[PDB]
Symmetry: none
Subunit: 221 residues, 3 copies
Amino acid sequence: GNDVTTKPDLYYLTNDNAIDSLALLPPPPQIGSIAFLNDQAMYEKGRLLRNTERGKLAAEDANLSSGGVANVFSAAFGSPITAKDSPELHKLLTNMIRDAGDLATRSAKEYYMRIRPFAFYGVSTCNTKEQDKLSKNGSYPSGHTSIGWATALVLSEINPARQDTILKRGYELGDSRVICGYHWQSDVDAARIVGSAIVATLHSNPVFQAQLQKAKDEFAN
Amino acid sequence: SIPPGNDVTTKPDLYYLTNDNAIDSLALLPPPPQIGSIAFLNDQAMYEKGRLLRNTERGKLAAEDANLSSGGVANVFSAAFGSPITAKDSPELHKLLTNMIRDAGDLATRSAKEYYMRIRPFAFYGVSTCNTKEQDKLSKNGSYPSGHTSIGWATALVLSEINPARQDTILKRGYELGDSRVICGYHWQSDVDAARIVGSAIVATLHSNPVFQAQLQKAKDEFANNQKK
Amino acid sequence: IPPGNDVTTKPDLYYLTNDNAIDSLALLPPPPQIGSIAFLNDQAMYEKGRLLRNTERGKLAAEDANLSSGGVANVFSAAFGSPITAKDSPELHKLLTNMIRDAGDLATRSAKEYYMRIRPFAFYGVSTCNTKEQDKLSKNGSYPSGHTSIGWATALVLSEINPARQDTILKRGYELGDSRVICGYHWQSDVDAARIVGSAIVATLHSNPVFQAQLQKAKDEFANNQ
C-alpha cells in the first residue's frame, strides 16, 4: 500500500519501517467470550450518551478528517494548531497521520476484518457522513484511535506543562469512537498500543527528527 | 497532583524526573474493573487461564521473568535487542535504562496505585504465585496499574527507538513481560493493560527532559559504534 | 406421546407407532431459561451464526435449510460417496424416506408441545437467511429441533451402511445442526438436545422389524453397487 514513497505529505516511513500490528496484538474478543459481552455493554453505555453534551462532542470528534485531528487538540495544547498559526507543528502532525492511521494498523485490520458496531447492530452512528466508507473496513484495531493517541504523545513531548490535559484529551478521542458506534472498546484499547509503538518508530526517523526540532523551536519562540 | 515520594531530587540515579513532571495516572486512567462488573469476571477468567499455564514452557519463562528485580530488566532484553545490555558491554545504554527505572515504575503509577490500592490476585485468592521469592513485599501493594509492566513497556519503546531493525522482537518481548505477571498471578490483566498506557505517557515526558535526551544520544552513538565491530 | 401421525396413518414416512416413540419430555432437561448463563450462551451463538450468514458457510447453511424432509437423504451424497436418490439407490432412499418422520416428529413431539419454545428469529423479530420456510415454522416450539434429529439419525444409519466414510458422514450430519443455528431457526441448545433424541430414535428403529428388513435390503444394494 501507500507509504512515504508514494504520498510523502502524509507518511515519514516505509513499509518495512512499519510496525507489524498482527504479530504484536492479541486477537480481538470472539463472540462467545466474556470480553465480548463487555464490548457489547460498552456499546450500549456509549449509545445512551449520544444525546448529551458528551455525545455532541463525540460526534464532532468523529467528523475530523485526518487534517483536523491536530486542530482538535488546541484547547488542551494551550494555543491553536493551524497551518496559519503554528505551521511547522501542523506540518509535523500532518506528515505522521498515515504512519499511525494506516501503516501501524494495516496488517491487523485486513487479517481480522472485524465487523464494526453500527454494522453489527444494523443501526446508524451518531453522524452518518462518516460511516458509508468506514463500514467496509476492519474494526480491529482503530486507525483513528491510533492517530489520536500518537498525536497526544508527540504534543506531550512538546509542551509537558500541559501533558495531563493533552493526554486526557487524546484518551477521550478513543472514547468518542465508542460513544458514536464506530468501534468496539477493545478496538480502541489495542489502537493505543500501536499508537505508542509508531511513536517510537518515528523517533528513529531522521526526517521526523528534523521536523520535530523545527516544531519545538516554533514553540519556544 | 501526585502523593509524596522520591524523584530525581532524592535518587538521581533512579529517576530523571521530578514529582511535578510526573503524569497524573489517577486522572488519566479509568478506575480498575469493579467487583460486580463483567470486566472483573474477565480478570478472573484470565487469572485462571494463566494459572493452568504455570506448568508449561510458557510458565517456565513466566517464572524466570518474575525473578528480575528492577535492575535486571535491562538484561532480559538482550536476546531481543541483538546484543548484550550490560554495564561492561554497553555502559551508556545500561546507564540510560537504569536512570529511568523509577520514572516508569514509580512516578508514572503513583497517584493511581495509592488511590485504588487494588488487591493483587494471589492475595485475593489466598494462594502463592509461581515464584514465591518476591511475594511478601508486593502483597500489601496496590495492584493497579502494574509498575513492573510499566517499566518493561517503556524500556521496550526506548530500545525500539534505538534499534528499529528489531522493533518487532523488542516490542514482543516487552509485551510478554506483562503477560508473565499475569501468568504467575502477580497482577490482574487489567493492571497490565493500564500499565502500558502510563508507560507510554512517561516515555513521552522523558523525551522532554534534557538529561534524558543527552544520555539517549550517547547510547545511540555507542550502539552505532558497536555495529561496526 | 401427544397425538399425531405415525406408521398407522402415514406408513411411507414412519416405521414406528405412537406407543413405540421415545418420550422426549421425560428424557431431555428443560431448555435454558431466560435469566440463565446458558441462555447467555445461546444468545452469543445466535449472533455468531448471524455474522456468518454472509460467509460461504452461511450460503451452505441456507441451501441446507431449503430442504423439506423429502431431500435430506440427498444432501449426504457427497459425504456418502455415491448418489442417494430414488433412481440410483431406491432401497436406501426408501429406508431414509420412511424414517424421516420417526426422527423428525415422534422422537421430538412431547417436548416440543410442552415447552413451545420461541425460535430465535421470532425472539429477535428478524428474518432468517432464507425467508421461504419461515412463516410456517415460527409458531412451533423450537426445543428440540426436528430437523437436527432427522439429520443426526440419518447420519448414524448411513454410517452403519458405509463405515469407510463414517467420519465424513457424521461430520456432515453434525453440520446440518450447526446450519440451523447459523440461519436462525434454532438455538444452540435446541440442536444439542435434538442430537440426543436422534440417537434414541435410532435405537428404537433398530428394534423394529420392518426397519431391520429395509436396512438389510439397503446394505445389499450398497454392496452391489460397490
